[PDB]
Design a protein around this ligand. Structure first.
Ligand code: NAG
Ligand code: NAG
Lengths: 49, 49, 48
């Protein structure tokens, strides 16, 4: 999670993170690509039948 | 704010006890997580959000 | 909430993710090691 990692328990960083744009939209959708592929990797090796 | 310990979080009682030369407590992140209480002699854990 | 997250008026059939858990701020407390060994001012206003 972006906001509560780089700025723990500080509500002023929520204002400064949104004006950097779609960095955290990209980073969350990047790591979700790994987080759905690992389900696909285990289903690929074991579930041929 | 425990004599300059700036931060926001909820407060619980910690079962562990400090030595008389100890006042603070760190972690892997090197930040305050459980400290001795200032005006009373028991150890309080700062549970985060 | 997930429509706000996806920046669109329509979402698709699936699991998404929103903002994580955080307890909103309510108040502020201050405390300090209690008062001991006070300065001798009683002598300097009640001097004989
Ligand atoms: C300060 O706090 C300590 C620990 O609770 C206590 O023993 C002491 O009597 C207190 N002193 C005063 C003046 O309140
Ligand atoms: C200073 O002296 C006056 C008169 O004797 C007395 O009323 C007062 O309580 C004294 N101050 C303190 C802090 O005891």
């Amino acid at each position: 999670d972006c906001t509560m990692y780089i700025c723990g328990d500080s509500t002023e960083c929520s204002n400064l993170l949104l004006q950097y744009g779609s960095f955290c939209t990209q980073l969350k959708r990047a790591l979700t690509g790994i987080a759905v592929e690992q389900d696909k990797n285990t289903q690929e090796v074991f579930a041929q039948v | 704010n425990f004599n300059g310990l700036k931060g926001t979080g909820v407060l619980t009682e910690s079962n562990k006890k400090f030595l008389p030369f100890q006042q603070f407590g760190r972690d892997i992140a090197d930040t305050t997580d459980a400290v001795r209480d200032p005006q009373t002699l028991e150890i309080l854990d700062i549970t985060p959000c | 909430e997930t429509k706000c997250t996806l920046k669109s008026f329509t979402v698709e059939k699936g699991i998404y993710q929103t903002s994580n858990f955080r307890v909103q701020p309510t108040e502020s407390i201050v405390r300090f090691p209690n008062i001991t060994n006070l300065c001798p001012f009683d002598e300097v206003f009640n001097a004989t």
